[PDB]
Amino acid sequence: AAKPYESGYIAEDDFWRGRGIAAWVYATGANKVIAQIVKDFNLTDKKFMVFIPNDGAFARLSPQLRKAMMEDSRLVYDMLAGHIFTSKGSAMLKDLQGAGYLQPAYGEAIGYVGTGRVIKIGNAQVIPESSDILRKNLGFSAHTLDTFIVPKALTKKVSIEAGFSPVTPAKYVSTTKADLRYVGATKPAAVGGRRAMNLMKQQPFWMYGPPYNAVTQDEYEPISAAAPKAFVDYQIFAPGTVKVSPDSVNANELNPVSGMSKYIGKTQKLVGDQGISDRSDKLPM
Template sequence: MAFASSQALPLRGISVTSACPAALPRRRAQGAAARTASSSRTRMLAQSNAPVASSEPTLAQALSLPAFSTLRAVVAVAQLDLSAVSGTLFAPTNAAFKRLSAELVQMVLGSADVAREVLLRHVVSECVPSSKLTGNAFLSSLNGGALPYTSYGGLQIKIGGISLGAQTDISFDKGVVHALDGVLKPPAQTWPSFSQSYIAPVAKPSPPTIATARAMGATTTSTLGGRKAMGLMTQRPFWMYGPPYCAAKQEEYEPISIAQPDVSFVDYQVMPPGSVIVTPDSVNAAELNPVSGMSKYIGQTKRLVSGDGLSDYSRLD
């Protein structure tokens, strides 16, 4: 594939007609009146089906802003055809690349495989305007990795923990571009080694294992995000309250049954990322001990029970 340069699009959307012909001599015009009338309908039909011009720029044109010059260099190294890209591109700015170490930048610019993997991490096939990035959910990037996003009242949107830049909703003919204040790292293919950089060196991608998925899931910004990133659950609405990913229905993650619900209450709290096992000292409600819904799994919730209600369970596994 070759790097797509900015080119004019085929005309679409606006009828294209030739210039008006020069006026014919009166006698020839009168003599050709019948022929003109009979062919006018054919010309009108042809004009109605003529190609039309698009008012939207190409992706290459949308990335022609000075803030994306480093990204354009990465595209050139990866030899990606931008004309084939559709959906949403989260585009790291020059400032985003400057936040990386010089060694990582050289790694990206020095390898077509790494550059391609980094670029595909920033593209999703759906066209997602910023107004649709609300709450906490996930997109799927073109390299196959889950791409979590969070939005706090629509005022601060983060993609993979990185804030969107000032320039968002830049339309192009096949989708939309959002500037990004950081560079997303591709999904790790081996046991992750964490550093201050956003990019993990990946030269030859290989299918992730369950162990890798679990390791990456335990390091995401939220417990819910960890389960989704591990690919070990099907998301259901009540999972916003933190049941284990292995639960098929709500009853399966209730370790405590309140004997006296009128005099007690339950508070679900998300545990810190990376938590693996929580072993409670007691399930006595009066002691307010945190307990795990399924303590043998990664990233569970703790449940605080208050009041006089006591659990009728003596074990939690």
């Protein structure tokens, strides 16, 4: 519990620290529990067998099972006692062949099947690549699982309908330019003024014409009803100071064979812009 490289790797809680199978044991306080399981059932003399689940098998614990171990200390006592087996002593993996049973340190009989190099301890499976190491000091034998051994008697009150069902909350993907426009349409029209028509949106180009007749936002403004009796004379000015530009000098660009023209006639309101305008520039008057 200090320097793993100190005193080589011949200490008992420094050998398993330097074997990279299960570093979850010393990460939490499960190292202290299984040294007190081996004292309460007097296993310091008899040869026995342990099944240690590796790193990776600690990570695939369920979220509802792990919270049962963080709040009942007798449950993590009974679970870790079920990985120490006193049935056939310091067995290797060649004596786990066939179908039989094994007896734990505390729990009830746990059945095994072993078919060649594939050995199941029941709810788990022995990883044979690393698994036939034996200790002569404190004498016992160690094998590696891929899952925790967890009996069905201990999971009779874990559940996924208690608060462990997964959720992901939905989001709204609005923009700052869109929400600054729509918030002017929440004032009354006696207050908001031109901002009362800020909820309307841009439609397709054909929607503004003759069966449909959708109204643009410029027509709600007083600029659409400007018709003064006064007029500029245009002969007051000096010659050279009146400018005139067309939109095109091309006949089928100004009016095609169809009547769909941007420039001439009543079809110049059929355009993909100009349904909405900027009346958030000035004021609520």
